[PDB]
Every structure is written in C-alpha cells, then in structure tokens.
C-alpha cells in the first residue's frame, strides 16, 4: 500500500532527535566530573531536560512511524488520511523543536512565565518539563494520530496485532492526560506522576512494543500468524497482570500507605516475565522459520531487543524492585543505571528494529540494502548495544558504591552527598568513555544508509 | 491452548486488576490527609511547591528520592542545616550566595528569587520533610 510512505518522515526525524539526545547526554556526563563545565550558560538541569525530552519525543516519533507503516498492511487498507499524517508530522516536529529551544534559550522560570504557566501550572516535573501549551500541542497531534490510524483499523481487517497496537496507543494518549493534572499536594502529585511514567513504560508501551515485535516477527519469519498472535496475547496478559498493581514499586517512599510495600514488591517480582517471554518469543520464532530474510540486520535487532529489554527492564528492574532493597537504592546511580538499559533495551531498540525492516522498502530500495550497508548497521548495533551495557555496568558500580558509602552507615558514619560523589569519579569518567563509544556507535549506524 | 484463552486471560486478568487498582487508589487517596499532614499544608508551602517547580530543582536534586542525581536529596536537607528553627534564614543565605565558584565543583544557578519566594520555598521543604515516607531515607544524608 502506497500510503505506508508517511512513516519515513517520523523515522528520519526520530533519528535526528536521537543524535541530539545523545549529545546532551555527553554534556551531562562531563558535568558530573567537571562540575562547572558549560556553567552558567547551560546548567545541568537544562541539559538534562533536553536529554530527557528528546529521548521521549523521538521514541514517540518512532512509535507513530511504526503505527503508520504496519497498520495499513494489517488492516489491508490504504491509511485513512495520508495528508493528515503529513500535516500532523509538521505540527509535532515544530512543537518538538520549539519546546527544546524554550529550555535552552530562556531561564526555566522565565519560560514558565513566558508560556503562561501561571494560569495552568504543569511545568518543572520530571519528564514533564514541557510548558502547558507544549503539552496541549502533543495531545492534538496524538488525537489526530489516534483518529487517523484508528479509522484505518475500523474499515478493513482486525488482526490481533492491529488491536493491541491500537489499545497501546489509545492507552498512551489517555494516560498522558494526567500530565495536565498537577495536585498541590506533593504526595498526590507523585502518586499521579507514575500513572504517566510507569503505566506508559511497563504498561501500554509494552503493547506497542509487543505488537511491533510481533509484526516484524510475522514478516521476517513467515511463521503462522495464528501462533504469533497467540504468543503476543500471552506476552501482554503477563505484562498487565504484573504491571497494573506493579505501579506499587514507585509507591514505597512517597508517603502513600505501607501496604504498597507488600503489594508493590510481590507484583513487581513477576514483571520480568513478559520480557523473558519476549526473548523466547523472538528466539523460538526466528528459530523455526519458513524463509531466509535478505536483511539479516532485522533479525539481529529483533533478538537484541528482547535480550536487552530483558536484562535492562527484567534483570535490572528486579535487582532493585524489592522494598527492603529499594529502600537503600531509591534515587541513586542504580536508578540511572536501570533507567538507561531498560529505556534503550526495550524502546530505542524496538524502534531501530522496525526502522531496520521498513526503511529499505520505504525508500524503494527493496527488501534489504547492499551487503556493504548491512555490515555497518550491525557494527552500529553492537557498538551501541555494548557501549550501553558498559554504561550500565559502570553506573551500577557507582551505584553500589554510593549505597555503600551514603545509605548504609549510621548518622555520622555515612558520607555526605557531595563527598561520596567524589569517590564515584572514576566510574563517572568510564561512563563518559562508554558514552563516546556509543555516539561513535550511533554515527556508524546512521551511516549504514 | 488457543489464541482465544490467551485473549481472554488478557481481557479479564486486565479488567480485574484495573478495578482492583482504582479501588486501592481510592483507599490510598483517603489516607493522605493524615499521612502528609495536609492540615499543616499551608498557602506558603503550596506557594513554595510552585517555586520548586518553576525553577526545576528536580532537575538536579531528588525530593523524597525522586528527581535528578546531580545534587543532594532535599526531602531532608532541613536536618543538615541547623534544623527547624533556623532553616528559613539559612535558605535565604544559601540562595543568595550561589553559585559558589569553587573550581571543578558542581554548581548551583543563581535564581534571583525574592525574599518572599525563598521563604515559601523554605516552608515547602520543611513540610516535605515531615511527610510519612515509611522511614525513608535511611539516614541524615538522604
């Protein structure tokens, strides 16, 4: 279907913003260990919100990309409005670049003032640093998009893949509405903040990832749709059965009642399951396949994702998910460690996977690329992937050492925040290194076409 | 084991836990007034939650263990700067002297906040510190 071509802009742009995100990472990396680097011009918290919003925005572009591509195939339909795809691409990307420039160009408090955050205050919350108008923008883009891709689904075929992806995206935009709801009570604020961050990332974002993976597995393997979709439903069933009440692992220390310590730990300990079942999913169905796919990079991606997600979200989420363990680890370098490997493993990777599959045919080059462009892509893969595992390694080390020096000893025995940061210095340096190996890795990947 | 029993475990398993979750959030949202001491949550503290948000403290600090990991945990900073009685006065000085300009050291912005704003900010943080976080953090250091 010739209106799958509206996915290209979203994919290209996602990769553009991804280069940004990394660059702003490397800045923060350096700031850790050279405390005045880029100060006052670009303070740490500014570099952070840029690093942080680009990650989320670019993934959202990848997601709309993926949806625009795979949905018409699944519905056996032309995409409802290929123009509205193209116009909603400019609204989103405009509002994207604009809000990123808001951050860099005006002192944050000024940006709150400038954008009239006075009237309807939503700013200065983690991952939610975008002004209230910036958010409004993202909802209209999201509603046009849901309608657009949803109409396509409604006429023509329902497939499990279709429905799940849809349920995922509806769930994403809906929960994003809570980012307009900012209680004056700190705990109430925190309670609801997780309805966005966690129910996205261990909730509805898992259906988006499952369905995308499940689609790619259908095409590159040729294994029966009946079996793929059956597996899919198992994956998401496990995701939500553990995930929903699993929100509780963010509910330990914010001042909601103690029974969450129990509820949160137990339900979280099962949260690795979906990801492990996604490993088995990809390995088993790449294992018994009808065809030999001319693009061997997709199969790499597909596997690396389930593995990385599992390690990052699964294993690393598990290390600190238990209340008596998280009590000491909460808000430390452990957290940044887990945060990185899970975001990269499940989401960056799933996105790069679908781009690996669909970009070649999206440009009219065919099923795959010249064997010269494939070997770069896998050099790209491995570098990023391996750089990231090192990143999270270094950070876990910094983390344990932090919990050791800071959290464990008694008053007077425990090191102060700044003091213990000084001890972590070498890990912070090695992490910059690893970050450089990662940028180089991204560039490699981008040059593979 | 068909696609159907899978799809149904998905539906019912899901719709069950969403209801169980709303039920628990209702129960929890009744608990807060006493847990967080909302009666003592004054206009000052609420006006301070604003200063905290407008300036993105969270972009370098953690509050009750959530935020950035670049600078100290502020949920319990009160206990590190001459306690309850003297904290507002400290914070006034603290905010005015930034950035400290020690070479190589992580630096804090000058936010140019009025005396009034820093006073609300101080009430915010004092209030925050007296929330029942089930005994978090482990010690005086956050």
């Amino acid at each position, epitope marked *: 279907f010739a209106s799958q071509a509206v996915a290209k802009p979203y994919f290209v742009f996602a990769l553009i913003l991804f280069v940004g995100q990394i660059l702003f990472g490397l800045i923060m990396g350096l700031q850790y260990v050279v405390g005045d680097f880029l100060f006052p011009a670009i303070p740490f918290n500014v570099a952070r919100m840029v690093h942080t919003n680009l990650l989320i925005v670019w993934l959202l572009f990848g997601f709309m990309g993926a949806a625009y591509y795979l949905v018409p195939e699944e519905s056996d339909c032309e995409l409802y409005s290929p123009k509205l795809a193209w116009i909603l691409f400019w609204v989103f990307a405009a509002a994207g670049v604009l809000t990123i420039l808001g951050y860099l160009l005006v002192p944050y408090a000024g940006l709150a003032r400038l954008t009239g955050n006075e009237l309807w205050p939503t700013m200065g919350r983690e991952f939610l640093e975008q002004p209230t108008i910036s958010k409004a923008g993202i909802v209209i883009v999201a509603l046009g998009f849901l309608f657009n891709v949803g109409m396509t689904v409604l006429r023509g075929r329902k497939t499990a893949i279709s429905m799940v992806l849809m349920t995922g995206l509806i769930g994403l935009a809906l929960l994003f509405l809570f980012s307009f709801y900012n209680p004056e009570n700190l705990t109430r604020d925190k309670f609801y903040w997780w309805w966005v961050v966690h129910l996205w990332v261990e909730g509805v974002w898992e259906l988006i990832m499952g369905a995308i993976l499940a689609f790619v597995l259908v095409k590159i393997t040729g294994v029966d749709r009946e079996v793929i979709e059956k597996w899919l439903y198992v994956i998401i069933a496990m995701a939500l059965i553990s995930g929903i009440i699993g929100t509780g692992h963010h509910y330990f220390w914010i001042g909601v009642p103690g029974y969450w310590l129990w509820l949160g730990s137990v339900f979280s300990a099962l949260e690795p399951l979906p990801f492990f079942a996604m490993v088995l999913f990809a390995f088993n169905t790449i294992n018994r396949r009808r065809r030999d796919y001319p693009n061997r990079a997709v199969a790499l991606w597909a596997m690396g994702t389930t593995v990385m997600a599992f390690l990052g979200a699964g294993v690393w989420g598990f290390m600190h998910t238990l209340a008596p363990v998280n009590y000491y680890t909460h808000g430390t370098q452990l957290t940044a460690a887990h945060g990185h490997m899970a975001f990269y493993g499940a989401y960056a990777m799933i996105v790069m996977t679908i781009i690996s599959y669909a970009m070649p045919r999206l440009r009219g080059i065919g099923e795959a690329m010249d064997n010269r462009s494939q070997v770069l892509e896998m050099w790209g893969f491995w570098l990023m992937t391996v750089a990231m595992v090192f990143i999270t390694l270094f950070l876990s080390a910094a983390g344990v050492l932090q919990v050791w020096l800071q959290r464990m000893p008694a008053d007077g025995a425990a*090191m102060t925040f*700044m*003091a213990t*940061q*000084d*001890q972590l210095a070498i890990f912070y340096w090695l992490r910059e290194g690893a970050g450089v190996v990662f940028l180089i890795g991204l560039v490699a990947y981008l040059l593979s076409f | 084991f068909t696609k159907g029993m899978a799809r149904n475990i998905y539906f019912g398993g899901s719709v069950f836990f969403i209801l169980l979750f709303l039920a628990l959030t209702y129960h929890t949202e009744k608990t807060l007034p006493e847990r967080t001491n909302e009666a003592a949550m004054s206009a000052a503290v609420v006006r301070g939650k604003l200063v905290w948000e407008q300036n993105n403290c969270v972009g370098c600090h953690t509050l009750l263990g959530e935020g950035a990991y670049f600078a100290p945990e502020l949920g319990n900073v009160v206990g590190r700067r*001459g306690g309850e009685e003297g904290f507002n006065t400290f914070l006034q000085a603290w905010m005015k*002297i930034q950035p400290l*300009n020690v070479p190589g050291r992580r630096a804090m912005p000058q936010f140019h906040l009025s005396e009034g704003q820093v006073d609300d900010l101080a009430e915010f943080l004092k209030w925050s510190s007296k929330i029942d976080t089930n005994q978090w953090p482990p010690n005086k250091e956050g």
Partner: antibody
Amino acid sequence: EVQLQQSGTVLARPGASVKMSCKASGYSFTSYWMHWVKQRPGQGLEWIGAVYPGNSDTSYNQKFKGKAKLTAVTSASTAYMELSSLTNEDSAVYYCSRSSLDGYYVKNWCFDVWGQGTTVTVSS
Amino acid sequence: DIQMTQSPPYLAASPGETITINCRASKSIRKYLAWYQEKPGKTNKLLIYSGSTLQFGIPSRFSGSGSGTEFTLTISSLEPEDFAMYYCQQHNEYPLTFGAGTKLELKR
C-alpha cells in the same frame, strides 16, 4: 552542632615526640578535610597540613614535611597529629579545623569550625 | 608560596564607628580570601570567604571585598563584641597561607 575537641597540654624534651588528638562530632567525619594550623606567640598562623578521613590521604606543607604526621581513625571520628625531633621552635599552640566545604576535591579551602588548640611546650 | 601582609597591625576605634582593614597577597589569589575573628576563650570564627561572601550566621554589619592581590574587611557600625583579632587566609592555592593579624582595640 559541629564541634572539634582537642587534647590537652603536652610537655616534652628536645628531640622527643608528642601526639595530639582532635575529636570530631556533629557532622560526617569522613566527608571533610581536617586541617592543622600552628601558632607561636606573635608569630601568625601557619598551615601545617591536612588529612581526609574519607580515604586517609594527607597533604603537607613542605615546611613541615618531616616534622608532622597526620592520621585518622574513622570509627572514633578522631584525627591525630604527631610531631617529632622536637626543637624549641616547636613550642606553640596547635589547632585542628574542618574545611567549610565537603568532599575530597576541595583540598585548599577555608575552615568553618576550629578546635580550641593544643599547647606544646618543649623544654629541658 | 604566596605571602600575606595585613595592615594596619592594630587599630583603635569606638562602638558605632566604621573601620576597614587590609590584606595584600604577594601574588594573585583571584577571589579566594577568607577572614577569621579571634577572641579569648572562644574558637576562631569564619566571617567571610571568597573575598565577599558572608558566612552563615554572621551579622551583615560585616562585609568584605577585593580580587587579585588586594582585599579589605569592613565593619559597618562597630559593636562591643567586634573588638577582637582579625586574620585573613588565602584559599586559592596549596599551601594555604595566613596574614599575621590586625588587632582591633576599643578606644578610650
């Protein structure tokens, strides 16, 4: 309240050793450089050196490199200074003081709290 | 080493007045100078650091400025407890070094 408790007066013969202590309380002892300053009457203060109980590192003024030895015992939040080959020049008041900022990298800063001083009298 | 000269070495004044004292560095210490107050039977008290920053708890009647090699301490309106010994310390380089003092005597 951040407090430093120093040991009492010591008398010694020329060429002997003495070892004085500085007992810290009310802060994280392993997080702050502990500094030692010498004062002889109408002579003005001179910085002897510093220990960092955090990792046990030390830093000496060349003027004192051989004369003084600094150490710390974490468990007891106390730092210690040893003076050797005592001469008359060494008769003086000796202070410990805490760096006013925390961490290993601020080695040369100012101090926010001082001990009351330990008098060393060297005499035959 | 960088060496520090304080001037005057002593100075008389009366409660209510304003005095200003001097501290010169043998070479540039940039902005990093601190001052301490010494009183009998009290531990030494940090007043200002980095040239101009009041340390917590110190009355604002105290203030200080300077950069490079020349610095001053000023007391706006003298108070009985201000008559004391005042030392400056350079916090720019290893090894740390002090001025030899200024004695601020109560005039009668």
